[PDB]
Amino acid sequence: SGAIYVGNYRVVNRHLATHNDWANLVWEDSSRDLLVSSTTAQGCDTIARCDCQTGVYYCSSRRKHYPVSFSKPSLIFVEASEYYPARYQSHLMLAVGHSEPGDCGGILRCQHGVVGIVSTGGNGLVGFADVRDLLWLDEE
């Protein structure tokens, strides 16, 4: 589990969105595994605006933050999972590292702020859903 809280937005994995998220929907994209809902309180997070390929992510199934190198956001044919079938997922970044389903929502951060959240795992890789292209999160 986990979310990003930027302004009056809450960014979560689409597959973990709650009824309250869907009842307060701003934007959602199944291909990216992302959903954004509206919040009453302002959040603590800054979104990275950059093309970094190094950062640190939180792995709940290790209670640890790991430094990683990761690929630029791409279309990755992802095998079906505990929460999704085998399919292509867009705006996905991969690193070598540990990821189980409940690790979804862990933040990946670089020197500029939050890059994305854990979205996929398996075969010794972790995938992160990028948010750095969602420029509208920074306003309104």
Q: List residues near ligand ST0 by CB under 6 A.
A: 76-79, 94, 120-123, 125, 127
- Please check if 110 is assigned to a binding site: yes
The interface partner of residue 77, options being ligand ST0, Zn ion, none and the CB cut-off 5 to 8 Å by kind, is ligand ST0
Of 98 and 112, the one with the shorter C-beta distance to Zn ion is 112
- Please check if 59 is assigned to a binding site: no
- Please check if 50 is assigned to a binding site: yes
98 touches Zn ion by CB under 5 A = no
At 137 the three-state DSSP class reads helix
Give the side-chain half-sphere CA count within 13 A for 39.
17
Phi then psi dihedrals of residue 58, to 5 deg: -95, 130
In the residue annotation, 44 being an active-site residue is answered as no
Q: Which residues contact 123 (CB under 8 A, 6 or more apart)?
A: none
Q: Using an 8 Å Cβ cutoff, are 105 and 10 in contact?
A: no
Please identify every residue annotated as catalytic: 15, 33, 104
**Residues lying near Zn ion in the complex (CB under 5 A):** 48, 50, 52, 110, 112
